[PDB]
């Protein structure tokens, strides 16, 4: 009951909440050409369009720090679209979902399947709380998500949910974005038998 059953690179699942309940929105990223830029579509609002420019600044900065060999974001002409097409959307609960879509694209490696997230991001990566966590959690469950990432400040809003709703959700309560990265992209933080 969702738009994507398998998120490729550049596609992350987010959570949006309306007065009619929850819903699952998918952030998407792609290339336009083979200084680097950014483009946005999906009837986004003046408040969220700032969350894109913040997540874009942070994702570039995150690349600069952890994998400095990766120039993908500082040079490429990127395009972000959040379907469905004509629905209006405004709000920073898409912040982290965007960062992950940008990194996922800039790495060429998809995100954990069956993962939804929501949370406002700051410029330094602090993950700030968002609203209607009850309806975002419910729409993740009605839509088939097994791993949810909430802002850690939104812990009560999640545990106000009945016993049957939250059971069976791998939920992570995160304060910086580095905690979302280690969950969205697990293989990065995974022990291995270094051979040779």
Q: Which residues are catalytic?
A: 93, 136
Q: How far is CA 136 from CA 43, 105, 121, 131, in A?
A: 20, 25, 17, 9
CB nearer ligand UKS, residue 64 or residue 144:
144
Q: Nearest distance from residue 43's CB to ligand UKS, in Å?
A: 9
Please report, as ranges, the residues that interact with ligand UKS according to CB under 6 A: 14-19, 25, 27, 48, 82, 87, 89-94, 97, 130-131
Are the C-beta atoms of residues 171 and 15 closer than 8 Å to each other? no
> Which is closer to ligand UKS, CB of 21 or CB of 108?
21
Q: Where are the beta strands (DSSP E) in the chain?
A: 12-18, 21-31, 37-41, 77-81, 115-117, 120-121, 127-128, 147-151, 170-174
Q: For ligand UKS, give the closer residue by CB, 12 or 73.
A: 12
Give the C-alpha separation, 172 to 158, whole Å: 11
Tell me the closest approach of the beta carbon of residue 151 to ligand UKS, in angstroms.
11
What's the closest the beta carbon of residue 102 comes to ligand UKS, in angstroms?
A: 13
Write down the least CB distance from residue 69 to ligand UKS, Å. 29
Q: How far apart, in whole angstroms, are the C-alpha atoms of residue 12 and residue 18?
A: 20
CB count within 10 Å of CB 31 equals 12
CA distance 76 to 70: 11
Burial-class residue 179 by CB neighbours within 10 Å (0-12, 13-18, 19+). Answer: middle
> What is the nearest approach in angstroms of ligand UKS to the Cβ of residue 6?
17
Tell me whether residue 130 or residue 147 sits nearer to ligand UKS (CB atom): 130
Phi, psi of 93 (to 5 degrees): -70, 5
């Amino acid at each position: 009951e969702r738009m994507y059953d398998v998120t490729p690179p550049g596609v992350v699942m987010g959570l949006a909440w309306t007065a009619m309940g929850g819903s699952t929105l998918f952030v998407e990223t792609s290339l336009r050409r083979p200084d680097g830029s950014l483009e946005v579509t999906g009837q986004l609002g003046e408040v969220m369009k700032e969350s894109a420019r913040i997540a874009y600044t942070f994702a570039r900065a995150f690349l600069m720090q952890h994998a400095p060999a990766n120039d993908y974001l500082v040079t490429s002409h990127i395009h972000l679209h959040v379907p469905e097409g004509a629905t209006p959307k405004d709000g920073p609960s898409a912040g982290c979902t965007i960062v992950t879509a940008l990194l996922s694209l800039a790495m060429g490696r998809p995100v954990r399947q069956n993962l939804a997230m929501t949370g406002e991001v700051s410029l330094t990566g602090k993950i700030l709380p968002v609203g209607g966590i009850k309806e975002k959690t419910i729409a993740a469950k009605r839509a088939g998500v097994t791993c949810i990432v909430l802002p850690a400040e939104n812990k009560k809003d999640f545990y106000d949910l009945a016993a049957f709703i939250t059971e069976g959700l791998e939920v992570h309560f995160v304060e910086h974005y580095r905690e979302i990265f280690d969950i969205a992209f697990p293989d990065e933080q995974a022990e291995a038998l270094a051979v040779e």
